[PDB]
């Protein structure tokens, strides 16, 4: 049923919709185009923060190190970093801005601190993700050209990598919890998966937004008294407007809730 419902939602969107879910309480998993590539856009920033935290755990980076930068480093969509040219920001403040506001300059400064897109990709390979690839910087990585494998993931690989990072022992307990806390504090996803999930659930998420009608959201969801559910949703080549694309994502969450046994709103 869920596959046919998502096929109909995909038709409404006019684009290509990818979904992956895994429930760590029951083990139930689901995919719709789960092995097809989609542009990550800003969903990669969750993985970037994880790679930075791994360097902190190794003593190669410090969350309190202050990065100064200039006006010339600002790229489009930098709501936090544009306020701190004068004083700089610490590595922790840049991770917070990249995840919770999707700040693009913060992501570029963190990519520079990591060594670049190949460093992030090599980190992902080292933790068992053989799919996801980062090739470019902000804002070019949001081009989302159909057929272009640069800066892509698959819904199943991204949800699997989130499980490794948030439940596995890749990161120290402090770093793992910090990453979770940043995702829980996200400010950009209120109209996406969060809008379709039960109000009692605790949610961390990272959105992505790009050209070619690309709207994405990846989330870790804790229902009360319940091991977490991981959800990755990618929508691209969509023909409907930005609010309608957000509503597609929220509807995926509602459809997952409806298909899940014993789960409901209210
Ligand atoms: Mg359950
Ligand atoms: Na400066």
Author numbering: 28 to 58, 60 to 238, 240 to 252, 254 to 296
The authors write:
The starting point of the engineering efforts reported here is a Kemp eliminase we previously obtained through minimalist design on a β-lactamase background. Our design took advantage of the conformational flexibility of an ancestral β-lactamase scaffold to produce both a suitable cavity and a catalytic base within it through a single mutation, while a second mutation enhanced relevant interactions at the de novo active site. Kemp elimination is a straightforward proton–abstraction reaction that can be performed by a simple molecular machinery consisting, at the bare minimum, of a catalytic base. FuncLib does not per se predict mutations that enhance catalysis, but rather suggests variants with multiple mutations that generate stabilizing interacting networks at the active site, thus focusing the search to safe regions of the sequence space.
